[PDB]
Bromodomain-containing protein 9 (Homo sapiens), 101 residues
Amino acid sequence: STPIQQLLEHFLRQLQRKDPHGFFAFPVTDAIAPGYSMIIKHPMDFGTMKDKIVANEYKSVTEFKADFKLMCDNAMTYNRPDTVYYKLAKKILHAGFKMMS
Ligand SMILES: C/C=C/Cn1cc(-c2cccc(C(=O)N(C)C)c2)c2cc[nH]c2c1=O
């Protein structure tokens, strides 16, 4: 609806294209990642970001960028550097921030 919502939906679509496996698509469960909720205090994922856009909870691109960075930082905190997850998070973090200027 609103201009910011339209822009953030556009950014979100482009970011999700960089995650074809959808590792970032939904909240990480402790079943898939043992101990996750005990290690990551502020979980974030593309699905939650979509819900926040729809609810009109972002009022600036800066806020959206902060949630995107949080999501990537979480993946680089929980996962070791040699994992596909860590490597994807670092790659998408830089590409996403460039893509968003
Ligand atoms: C780039 C990752 C972002 C978030 N994330 C997602 C998964 C995840 C989620 C859903 C499915 C799978 C998967 O395909 N597995 C576990 C085989 C992984 C996972 C598993 C261990 N750590 C993580 C993780 O940090």
